[PDB]
Amino acid sequence: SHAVKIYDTCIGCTQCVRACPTDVLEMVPWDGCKASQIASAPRTEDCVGCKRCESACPTDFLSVRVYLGSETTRSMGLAY
């Protein structure tokens, strides 16, 4: 499966969670930013690796990072 690690520059904008087409990401409470929330990646077994989340992220550099890993049926996006 792909690894999705979150860093602490996240401003809690939730855009990566909304962008995700397979529901890998979710917002959890945090105290490190003004929005009082941070992205989390609890379901990377469903991550296809499209990097829509990284395209959505506004921080410089990225606060969500996708590291493509070992390929599975789910990560290859196969319906057969």
């Binding site: 690894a3 999705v4 690690k5 979150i6 860093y7 602490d8 520059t9 809690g12 939730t14 969670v17 909304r18 995700c20 087409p21 397979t22 529901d23 990401l25 979710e26 917002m27 959890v28 409470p29 945090w30 009082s36 929330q37 941070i38 989390s40 990646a41 609890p42 379901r43 990377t44 469903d46 296809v48 550099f61 990225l62 606060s63 990072r65 590291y67 890993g69 049926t73 789910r74 996006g77 196969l78 319906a79 057969y80």
Partner: protein
């Protein structure tokens, strides 16, 4: 809130069929079910291609991929203002509830969730790949 149970007596939308639906993977690996409650009978676009008619009341749709279920759910939420539930169904009969995982949509922050994958540093503070040689770790992001 508790995870809902998949009601197998739910009717399916009115559809004439297609070549884009389930394949052998549903028999031997897994498939997915999306359920939703429609306010009225109306036409929606199938994620596998073609127009279908959602029945008034509860609807059930079996799909090959989780991404297909979430694409249909995005359409239901943005075009029909309708919520839905997604399950994973295994060949042995096991049904796993998937989405929304804790009853609240993931884009809305909810108490009781715990961060996984969080790194307490900015991305430029990752170490060098030479420092993880012969350790078994996936990379500098893994440490």
């Amino acid at each position: 809130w508790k995870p809902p149970t998949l009601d197998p007596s739910t009717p399916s939308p009115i559809f004439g069929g297609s070549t884009g639906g389930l394949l052998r993977k549903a028999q031997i690996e897994e498939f997915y079910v999306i359920t939703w409650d429609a306010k009225k009978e109306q036409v929606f676009e199938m994620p596998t291609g073609g127009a279908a008619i959602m029945r008034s009341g509860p609807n059930l749709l079996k799909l090959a991929r989780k991404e297909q279920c979430l694409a249909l759910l995005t359409q239901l939420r943005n075009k029909f203002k309708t919520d839905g539930q997604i399950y994973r169904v295994f060949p042995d009969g096991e049904v796993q509830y998937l989405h929304p995982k804790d009853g609240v949509y993931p884009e809305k922050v909810n108490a009781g969730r715990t961060a996984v994958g969080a790194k307490d540093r900015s991305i430029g503070k990752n170490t060098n790949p030479v420092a993880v040689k012969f350790t078994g770790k996936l990379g500098t992001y893994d440490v």
